[PDB]
Amino acid sequence: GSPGIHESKEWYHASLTRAQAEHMLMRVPRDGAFLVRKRNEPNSYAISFRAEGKIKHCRVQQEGQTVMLGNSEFDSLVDLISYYEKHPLYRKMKLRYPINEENSS
């Protein structure tokens, strides 16, 4: 029907102040939560993810025909997160914190 290597939902917010995203992740009391978002330009996105008592937005760029995740060029933002669900991102966090809290699972 309408599945895809994109589309879907709940992991990329396209509209909010670049600094209000720090207050939405600061309002949530817990260690570990990853999300993605769109900057104020269609030439770069950003992974908003906090851990412990700190917040860590991340800036991903897009080349004319590919994407620069950070140290490698990936084929798309969905395949990026696909092998990234198993690999680390920064020196400690990953996509290991989906909806997380004592009342999640």
């Binding site: 917040i55 937005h57 991340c58 800036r59 140290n71």
Partner: peptide, 12 residues
């Protein structure tokens, strides 16, 4: 400063 971190999985 903590408003963006380049996503690198350990410096190796």
């Amino acid at each position: 400063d903590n408003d963006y971190i380049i996503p690198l999985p350990d410096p190796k």
